[PDB]
């Protein structure tokens, strides 16, 4: 994405009903930090209800704050994760991108708030924080500070203060069809030889030969009198094969 939203206004995107190859991102070696209760190593073989992507930009030193059971201004007032967080956290330097000559002050953070943020909560309130007992009257001043403080992102800032883009992927697993899995690799085809086959999860062993049986467009398998599988239709090419 060209520009991210601020950390106090972290951008959430919903992903569902698609195929995600987590291996590609995992085999990218382009991010500074990549943490996952989920095992990163080849678990694009699992299905989930949804994938929620929370993206923002923070200084490098604050990057550590995005983890379960973490404290800090980002964790307390900008972006809070549940202690039972499921998913991964990814971060990579954006000093080449979010830094700017003269100071990049678009990205802000919430330093002042009445209370800490709940898990997965976003607070964009522009109400002046009332530090003391005097009402703020809609204007910042003594005992009344603007809740949003502006980062100065520059190419010369320290790495800990340098901008880092952070994206958090949360997997949803509820009582639902769970339509995002993301695996499904296939192989070639072999005929006229005793082999072990797996067609769309249907397993078996035998010899696959070309057939002349005329299936219906919506039907995939053929059965005999004894309920044994007899013919199949190749998912990658719509043709009928006899099993012996």
């Amino acid at each position, epitope marked *: 994405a*060209t520009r991210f939203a601020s950390v106090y*206004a972290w951008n959430r995107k919903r992903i569902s009903n698609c195929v995600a190859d987590y291996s590609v991102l995992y085999n990218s070696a382009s991010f500074s930090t990549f943490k996952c209760g989920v095992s990163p190593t080849k678990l694009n073989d699992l299905c989930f209800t949804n994938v929620y992507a929370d993206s923002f930009v923070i200084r490098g030193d604050e990057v550590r704050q995005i983890a379960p059971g973490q404290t800090g201004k980002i964790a307390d007032y900008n972006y809070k994760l549940p202690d039972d967080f499921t998913g991964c956290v990814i971060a990579w330097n954006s000093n080449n*991108l979010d830094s*700017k*000559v*003269g100071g990049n*002050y*678009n990205y802000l953070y919430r330093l002042f708030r009445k209370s800490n943020l709940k898990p997965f909560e976003r607070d964009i309130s522009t109400e002046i924080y009332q530090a003391g007992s005097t009402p703020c009257n809609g204007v910042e001043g003594f005992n009344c500070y603007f809740p949003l403080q*502006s980062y100065g992102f520059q190419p010369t800032n320290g790495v800990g203060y340098q901008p880092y883009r952070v994206v958090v992927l949360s997997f949803e697993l509820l009582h639902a069809p769970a339509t995002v899995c993301g695996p499904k690799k296939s192989t070639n085809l072999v005929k006229n030889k005793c082999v072990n086959f797996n067609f769309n999860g249907l397993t078996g062993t035998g010899v696959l030969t070309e057939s002349n049986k005329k299936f219906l467009p919506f039907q995939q398998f053929g059965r005999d009198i004894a309920d044994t599988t007899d013919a199949v239709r190749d998912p990658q090419t719509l043709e009928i094969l006899d099993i012996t």
Partner: antibody
Amino acid sequence: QVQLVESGGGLVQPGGSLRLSCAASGFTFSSYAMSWVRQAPGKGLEWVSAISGSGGSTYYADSVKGRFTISRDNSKNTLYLQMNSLRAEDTAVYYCAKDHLITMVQPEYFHHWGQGTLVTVSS
Amino acid sequence: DIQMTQSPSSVSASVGDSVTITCRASQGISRWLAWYQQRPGKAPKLLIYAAGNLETGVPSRFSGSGSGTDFTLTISDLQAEDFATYYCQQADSFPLTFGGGTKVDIKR
């Protein structure tokens, strides 16, 4: 997608003052940074003034600084630009520009463009 | 400080050709740039923002490239409505500075 309407331009005596107004609708005024940019009749674009989603920070071009003043109000959802010591070089079409992204301190890009009003100074 | 030069000043080309406009900033501006088009009698409209990111309504044949100092706007397919004046501005150093301006005409 939003509506930006500029007004207040006209024909005034040299050394006079004017007050141009930008009416913004369709979006929250406070979260976006406004800009006033003049284009000369026979020249290209050049930025003049900018405000930052509030009024705390005012940015001015090097040829308009010391005479112009930019202010904004969320209550009436509008922008005001007061021009003092108007000269013959101030005759231009003024445009009220806004960027698609929610920018509060800096304008950066200018994706939204108004109709612009012609300000002419002559004797 | 950040005055930028846009070339070529004025060019002429036929329908269906490609037009290249090169804009150079005095200093490296990372990816803080905007390429605009403007026809006579109308307000200018953005073609490219950042460095090569296109506008939603602008046709896909308009492309932006370059980084830091050099930048290039390429029009792969010229049409009768592609003859206008093109500009480049920076969006990283205040005050914000525009380019010289490039006018596209019809080759004959």
